[PDB]
């Protein structure tokens, strides 16, 4: 009959999917070996509870995001290093920007952030945040004397 698979399963389906098998398979393979569970009203729900909960946790994730989309892309950032024409007297790793955005208009997030190496020249920059999948924030940053 119908079962809810706990794991990915070859030619049946992805975990959580509900597939229809012969009861012999279910009862002597799937159920014993924690591979799938019977599709009863009582855990047909636990399917949807997990679903609903998943949807909402992502909803807030696209909420406190949309905060960090309007509040960000809506300011700037100077850097109080020194500069002898070009190239910086200190140098800003994103860990600085971390604590740095956490400084001026301050602010705080958690790095990552696109600074594959730390900032060695000066000038006009706009660094790729991405707090959450499919939600881009370009962010204005200036490096000044």
């Amino acid at each position: 009959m119908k079962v809810i698979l706990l794991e990915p399963l070859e030619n049946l389906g992805d975990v959580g999917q509900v597939v229809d098998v012969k009861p012999g398979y279910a009862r002597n393979y799937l159920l014993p070996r924690g591979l799938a569970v019977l599709a009863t009203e009582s855990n047909l729900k636990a399917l949807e509870a997990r679903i609903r909960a998943q949807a909402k946790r992502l909803a807030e994730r696209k909420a406190e995001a949309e905060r960090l989309k309007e509040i960000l892309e809506n300011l700037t950032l100077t850097i109080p290093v020194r500069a002898g024409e070009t190239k910086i007297y200190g140098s800003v790793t994103a860990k600085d920007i971390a604590e740095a955005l956490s400084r001026q208009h301050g602010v705080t997030i958690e790095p990552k952030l696109a600074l594959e190496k730390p900032i060695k020249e000066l000038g006009e920059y706009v660094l790729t945040y991405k707090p959450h999948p499919e939600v881009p924030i370009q962010l204005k940053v200036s490096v000044v004397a």
Binding site: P23, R27, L31, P32, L38, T40, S42, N43
Partner: protein, 97 residues
């Protein structure tokens, strides 16, 4: 075979009627009963063996109720088992009926 531990289904006595002749509905002359005798019909008993609270407990059940075993187990998760004897688990289980 005894009685199904879930449904209480148990052998019944029933007649083996032997007939002869072409049925009326088939234009024949009628059916003639050439013998009745007592027999029994059995529940289709089988074995279900389930692990419950990390213990092997087996039911002897009719086929018409095998999934009832499995419904019990599922229901039985919310029960204070461990580290019971196999016998008292089974007991506790049936109580869920």
């Amino acid at each position: 075979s005894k009685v199904c531990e879930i449904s209480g289904k148990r052998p019944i006595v029933a007649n083996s009627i032997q007939r002869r002749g072409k049925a009326k509905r088939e234009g024949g002359v009628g059916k003639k009963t050439t013998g009745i005798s007592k027999r029994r019909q059995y529940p289709n008993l089988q074995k279900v063996r389930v692990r419950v609270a990390g213990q092997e407990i087996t039911f002897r059940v009719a086929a018409s109720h095998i999934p009832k075993v499995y419904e019990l187990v599922e229901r039985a998760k919310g029960l204070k088992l461990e580290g019971l004897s196999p016998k008292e688990i089974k007991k506790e289980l049936l109580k869920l009926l």
